[PDB]
Amino acid sequence: GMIDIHSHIVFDVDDGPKSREESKALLAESYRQGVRTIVSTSHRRKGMFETPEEKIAENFLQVREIAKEVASDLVIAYGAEIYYTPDVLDKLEKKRIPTLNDSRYALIEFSMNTPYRDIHSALSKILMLGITPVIAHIERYDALENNEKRVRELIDMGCYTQVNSSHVLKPKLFGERYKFMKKRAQYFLEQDLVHVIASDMHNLDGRPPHMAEAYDLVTQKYGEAKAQELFIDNPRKIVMDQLI
Ligand SMILES: [Mn+2]
Ligand SMILES: [Mn+2]
Ligand SMILES: [Mn+2]
């Protein structure tokens, strides 16, 4: 019963599925890997992903209906992946962009080269709104690379961290295109700086879930209890608006 808090499953709204058929197939693979709750977090990013909320909500509702054709016990929750620009503060305050399952948690992302001071300041301002940032794929940010103190300082401030399932995996013997991200993610896991693993799934070619593989790797490397914490228990608390 894994719980996936980072996903692009809504058709025709961002760089995720293009069609209902693609949404269904992505849901089915996710369920095949053992995922039983998925939080939809389609992009909200000024200058790149600006599909109106109303359309995202409309297609999301249709995706939730489609999930019933996959499994009766597949749970589809609403959410957003919020790229940080200053306008998102008023949007969150006014409840015009979604939090995760209507909890206090919002999924926040930055750019690869965003300076630490900007990351810290943005997250600080979101916290002041009464909202808890879950930081999307921490392995993406140059500012955090090999930097336990910075990560811990964001965490101690009141934030939580998320790592993509794809980057939990070992570098492949052939055709590895993302070794550096895998190396970053591995460092974060080793230093125990990861609250949640999520898929960030978009499709069934370049960006599928790797939740089952990642779950077993964490199980083997850190034990079953840590696998349950990162793939089930922490994501569940987020979904149920409980403190971690
Ligand atoms: Mn995307
Ligand atoms: Mn992202
Ligand atoms: Mn994403």
UniProtKB/Swiss-Prot annotation:
Keyword entries, A-Z: Capsule biogenesis/degradation, Exopolysaccharide synthesis, Hydrolase, Manganese, Protein phosphatase
Functional pathway: Capsule biogenesis; capsule polysaccharide biosynthesis
Keyword Hydrolase: yes
InterPro entries listed in its UniProt record: Caps_polysacc_synth_CpsB, Caps_polysacc_synth_CpsB/CapC, Metal_Hydrolase
GO biological process, one term: capsule polysaccharide biosynthetic process
Cofactor entry: Mn(2+)
Documented EC number(s): 3.1.3.48
Catalytic activity from the UniProt record: O-phospho-L-tyrosyl-[protein] + H2O = L-tyrosyl-[protein] + phosphate
Any one GO MF annotation of this record: protein tyrosine phosphatase activity
Pfam families: CpsB_CapC (PF19567)
Entry function: Dephosphorylates CpsD. Involved in the regulation of capsular polysaccharide biosynthesis.
Family: Belongs to the metallo-dependent hydrolases superfamily. CpsB/CapC family.
Family annotation (PANTHER family): TYROSINE-PROTEIN PHOSPHATASE YWQE
Protein name: Tyrosine-protein phosphatase CpsB
Organism: Streptococcus pneumoniae serotype 4 (strain ATCC BAA-334 / TIGR4)
